[PDB]
């Protein structure tokens, strides 16, 4: 069956360079067109570029956006296109993704994140929203690099609970929120915990909440 | 900037391919190929099993022989050997419906179940799933108490597999004659097309059982006197009655191959018409049976001369047989090409004519010399029949041995005929199976393990019974193959058993063990009960020369010992693989700083490599250092967080020893209690019957030992502190500060202390309880009939030796619990072998073993099928 099997990425500090590979299979790679396509988190799909097939020159175009900077290539013999990123920036953190054709994107690799970012590993710091229905929660604070799981009441409680996708603030560290809505009988021998979790800083903290 | 030229060549390469997957899918609605992936057959001529009816017909002998007795009946016939055993047991069936149940439905019910067995689906999967059943079959009089209407109606021949089996696909009942087991195969392949089903059963099935049909076709004169069918030959004199189960499983080829099953053949294409305005309304029409023949060749694709063989109706007729033969000689015999003559026979020449059941029974035929590249022989008595024009040469009987040999497509193929007396008529053309082409712990072993499954153990040993003179017959079949078979393409029932061999010799050799009561070294058996697993992590006594140094390549194993090595190399100066590989000045195993540390770090990655392998424990229990153990795999503590409780608590115990002493007493409580009166106290009591006594005083234990002399039996515990006594009171303040930063966390698994006699919510484990874990008695007796009388069915100790499975017998014993008792390693073994042989014994008792993990995939192969227990039902109304 036709394959996109995208790989590559990862974390990378700014100015420093990064070569993602697209490794096509069950189809005539050579025939197609090859283009690139990100999408910075949150927000829309932004072309980057594509390159012909060599039937139509092997020749390729690019974005504004990283003209001079990224170069595409494709390798025929191996069926596998390249997105070769140089003196990268932390505005080009996105998914990537590798599709087949330059005007009819007809096939999609699963993508593949980019984060470019100087901030070193660091823990989070739990600060609770104590239950001013009822309404507690945990804030995790000022990690790098993602992710970081929350539960509560170690997954005993899941009724009422909303995590909220991580944010990432201007210190280059990412904050987030998890919340639960109780029955206002905070303290009827109902404790409320929340187990964060952030596994890249060996990192396991308990939290009580209350008032 | 893309000029429109490549912008147009984009989306006509796109209409283009759209066009193809178009005109496939037209295909696939059309012809795609069914795959014939499991069957089964209980046809005349002692033929249980497929591989039977291949014996019977390879060693040219019928099955011609005089009525039996067992029915209600100058006289021969064809019949089966347990027409009339049921095992109403294994349906849910009261004996009061079973005896009122015509054969043909149980027969239909049983045999359904081997072809299940035969494809490798373990029956319960199919339950609430989309399959459908398909059952050629004739109203023969077999009632002529209660259940009778259900037991007699067609409809319920069909129905009542998918109830029994709780399928939800379509479920019919066929009646086209001699040709009805066709036409419920080709019907099955229009269902599977459609998408009314996923799989299905399709076969048919007959017993004679009335008084009419035997004398009825005598007074007709279409019989033989022999009861022999003669197929071909001058000597046709009719057919031979005779009777059957055929069956087959089918799939859509697309589906099988997804799913990795094994494909005997595929249906490449069948057709089903009728004879139409015919000399009569029992008269063939040699050129219907043309036009069926085409009109199969066009639903495949091919054309005659790629068919090698024909499976015949022959039915042994004087002039039946040449009007197939002309209706053959115009279709097959004619642009043969030079692939050579067509091979003809009929496999009723060696068990006449099953009825509804002929064709799937001709089908089963020509699938077993698919599997061997060899032409599937037919009696063939006498002479070739002087009414039948032979002269081309390119029509033979397939007399003897003969290669099966493909056609252009490399593909070798065989057309089976079935044509009913009410004229309606089938052909389907059979063609070998395509091409089929395409991680695990516990990882190299050499020997393999044999799970064995049945409803009652007679049924169990008879299972062992017959795959051990299987594996006898047919020795080179891969053992990996045995294995992976008996594990993951079989039901698992209650009664179980396990055999662990390297070889096929060794495999029978135990497997037969089985058969028989016996006790031998790689056999072991129990009965599988729900309740869970309880992982138990023992005290002191476990330790051997480098115990589990066999395991320490399991990666998962390794793995878990690298994190205890970085963990003990920080706190205590030295690690677990030096002591446990071999130890070139490590630390000695007789010092109680290093044993009780390397333990722990081998009970929790044995732990680890028990649920990597499908264990879950449903709760823990631990005794003494062990209870550490137990609070890492229950996650109410961390590793690193465990391997330093274990390594400053025993160092703790270390700065304490000397002037202590430790003693087993093979005695009750109270009664050593009571004696403990003057004469110092009890640490522990494991078991009804034994007490270890502590005290030290050395002194002291020197003489109880003494007294014990008298009668009880008492020995001294290679040690030299005094722990569970206030002995290890100064140690109190320097190791609750030490272990001041342990974190407990809620435990995932339930948590069961022998300290506090009740199950614990986890974090109560902070460096105070791990004192009062080293001072107080532990109260191991109490815990484990607590564990019980919750319903608690398997004690597994996790430990490189047992110490603590004896006491925990006793004390089921005394609570006459059925609970079992498992080890993982022993002294003499710690290799993957043995844990291997734990795993197959925990197997027996209920747990789920991911037989898959452990192992990796093998191939199925066609071992037999469940042993039914059939008692007798025969109603003589």
């Known amino acids: 069956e036709v394959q996109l099997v995208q790989s590559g990425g990862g974390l990378v500090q700014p100015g420093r360079s990064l070569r993602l590979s697209c490794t096509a299979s069950?189809?005539?790679?050579?025939?197609?067109?090859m283009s690139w396509v990100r999408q910075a988190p949150g927000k829309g799909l932004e072309w980057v570029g594509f390159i012909r097939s060599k039937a139509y020159g092997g020749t390729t175009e690019y974005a504004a956006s990283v003209k001079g900077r990224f170069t595409i290539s494709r390798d025929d013999s191996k069926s596998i296109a390249y997105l070769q990123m140089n003196s990268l920036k932390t505005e080009d953190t996105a998914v990537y993704y590798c599709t087949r054709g330059g005007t009819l994107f007809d096939y999609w690799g699963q993508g593949t994140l980019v984060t470019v970012s100087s901030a070193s590993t660091k823990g989070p710091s739990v600060f609770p929203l104590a239950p001013s229905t009822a309404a507690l929660g945990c804030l995790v604070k000022d990690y790098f690099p993602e992710p970081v799981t929350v539960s509560w009441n170690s997954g005993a409680l899941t009724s009422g609970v909303h995590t909220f996708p991580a944010v990432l603030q201007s210190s280059g560290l990412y904050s987030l929120s998890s919340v639960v809505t109780v029955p206002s009988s905070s303290l009827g021998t109902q404790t409320y915990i929340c187990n964060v979790n952030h596994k890249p800083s060996n990192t396991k903290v308990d939290k009580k909440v209350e008032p | 900037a893309s000029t429109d030229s490549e912008k147009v060549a984009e989306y006509l390469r796109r209409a283009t391919l759209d066009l193809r997957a178009a005109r496939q899918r037209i295909r696939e609605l059309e012809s795609e190929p069914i795959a014939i992936v499991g069957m089964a057959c209980r046809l005349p001529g002692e033929v249980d099993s497929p591989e039977r009816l291949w014996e019977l017909i390879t060693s040219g002998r019928d099955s011609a022989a005089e009525v039996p007795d067992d029915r209600g009946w100058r006289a021969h016939g064809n019949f089966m050997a347990g027409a009339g055993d049921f095992d109403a047991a294994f349906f849910g069936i009261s004996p009061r419906e079973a005896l009122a149940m015509d054969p043909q439905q149980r027969q239909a019910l049983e045999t359904t179940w081997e072809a299940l067995e035969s494809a490798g689906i373990p029956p319960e999967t199919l339950r609430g799933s989309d399959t459908g059943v398909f059952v050629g079959m004739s109203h023969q009089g077999y009632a002529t108490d209660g259940y009778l209407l259900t037991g007699n109606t067609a409809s319920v021949a069909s129905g009542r597999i998918a109830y029994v089996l709780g399928l939800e696909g379509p479920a019919l009942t066929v009646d086209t004659a001699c040709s009805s087991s066709l036409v419920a195969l080709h019907t099955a392949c229009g269902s599977l097309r459609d998408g009314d089903c996923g799989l299905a059963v399709a076969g048919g099935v007959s017993v004679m059982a009335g008084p009419e049909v035997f004398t009825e076709f005598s007074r007709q004169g279409a019989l033989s006197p022999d009861g022999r069918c003669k197929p071909f030959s001058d000597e046709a004199d009719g057919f031979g009655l005779g009777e059957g189960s055929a069956f087959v499983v089918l799939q859509r080829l697309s589906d099988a191959r997804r799913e990795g099953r094994r494909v005997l053949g595929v249906v490449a294409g069948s057709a089903v018409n009728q004879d139409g305005a015919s000399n009569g309304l029992s008269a063939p029409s040699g050129v219907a049976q043309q036009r069926v023949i085409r009109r199969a060749w066009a639903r495949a694709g091919i054309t005659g001369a790629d068919v090698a063989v024909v499976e015949a109706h022959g039915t042994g007729t004087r002039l039946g047989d040449p009007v197939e033969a002309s209706a053959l000689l115009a279709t097959y015999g004619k642009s043969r090409g030079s692939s050579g003559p067509v091979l003809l026979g009929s496999v009723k020449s060696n068990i006449g004519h099953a009825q509804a059941a002929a064709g799937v029974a001709g089908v089963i035929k020509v699938l077993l010399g698919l599997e061997r590249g060899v032409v599937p022989p037919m009696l063939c008595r006498g002479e070739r029949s002087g009414l039948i024009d032979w002269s081309s040469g390119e029509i033979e009987l397939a007399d003897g041995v003969r290669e099966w040999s493909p056609a252009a497509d490399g593909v070798r193929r065989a057309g089976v005929s079935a044509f009913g007396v009410s004229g309606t008529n089938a052909h389907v053309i059979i063609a070998e199976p395509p091409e089929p082409e395409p991680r695990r712990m516990l990882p190299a072993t050499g020997v393999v393990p044999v799970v064995l499954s049945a409803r009652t153990g007679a049924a169990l040993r008879a299972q062992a019974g017959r795959l051990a003179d299987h594996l006898a017959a047919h020795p080179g079949i891969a053992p990996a193959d045995v294995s992976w078979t008996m594990a993951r393409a079989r039901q698992h029932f209650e009664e179980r058993a396990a055999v662990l061999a390297a070889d096929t010799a060794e495999a029978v050799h135990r497997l037969r063990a089985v058969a028989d009561g016996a006790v031998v070294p790689g056999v072991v058996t129990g009965s599988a009960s729900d309740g869970g697993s309880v992982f138990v992590f023992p005290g002191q006594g476990a330790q051997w020369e480098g115990m589990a140094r066999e395991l320490l390549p399991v990666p998962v194993f390794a793995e878990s010992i690298a994190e205890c090595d970085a963990v003990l190399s920080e706190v205590a100066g030295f690690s677990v693989s030096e002591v446990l590989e071999p130890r070139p000045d490590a630390p000695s195993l007789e010092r109680v700083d290093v044993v009780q540390p390397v333990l722990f770090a081998v009970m929790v990655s044995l732990a680890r490599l028990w649920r990597a392998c499908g264990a879950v424990p449903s709760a823990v229990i631990g005794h003494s250092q062990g209870e550490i153990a137990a609070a890492v795999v229950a996650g109410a503590l961390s590793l690193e967080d465990g391997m330093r409780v274990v390594a400053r608590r025993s160092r703790a115990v270390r700065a304490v020893a000397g002037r202590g002493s430790m003693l087993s007493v093979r005695g009750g409580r109270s009664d050593v209690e009571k004696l403990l009166a003057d004469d110092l106290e009890v640490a522990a009591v494991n078991g009804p019957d034994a007490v270890v006594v502590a005290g030290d005083a050395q002194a002291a234990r020197e003489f109880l030992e003494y007294c014990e002399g008298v009668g009880i039996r008492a020995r001294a515990i290679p040690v030299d502190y005094a722990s569970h006594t206030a002995h290890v009171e100064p140690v109190r303040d320097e190791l609750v500060q030490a272990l001041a930063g342990i974190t407990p966390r809620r435990a995932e698994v339930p948590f069961f202390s022998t300290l506090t006699g009740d199950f614990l919510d986890g974090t109560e484990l902070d460096a105070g309880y791990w004192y009062r874990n080293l001072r107080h008695p532990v109260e191991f007796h109490s815990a484990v009939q607590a564990l019980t009388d919750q319903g608690y069915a398997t004690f597994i100790e996790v430990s490189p030796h047992p110490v603590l499975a004896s006491s925990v017998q006793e004390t089921l014993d005394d609570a006459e619990s059925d609970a079992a008792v498992l080890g993982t390693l022993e002294r003499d073994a710690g290799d993957a072998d043995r844990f291997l042989t734990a795993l197959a014994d925990a197997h027996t008792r209920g747990v789920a073993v991911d037989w898959e993990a452990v192992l990796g995939r093998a191939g199925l192969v066609d071992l037999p099928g469940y042993p039914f227990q059939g008692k007798r039902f025969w109603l003589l109304p």
């Open positions: 069950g189809f005539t790679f050579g025939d197609y067109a």
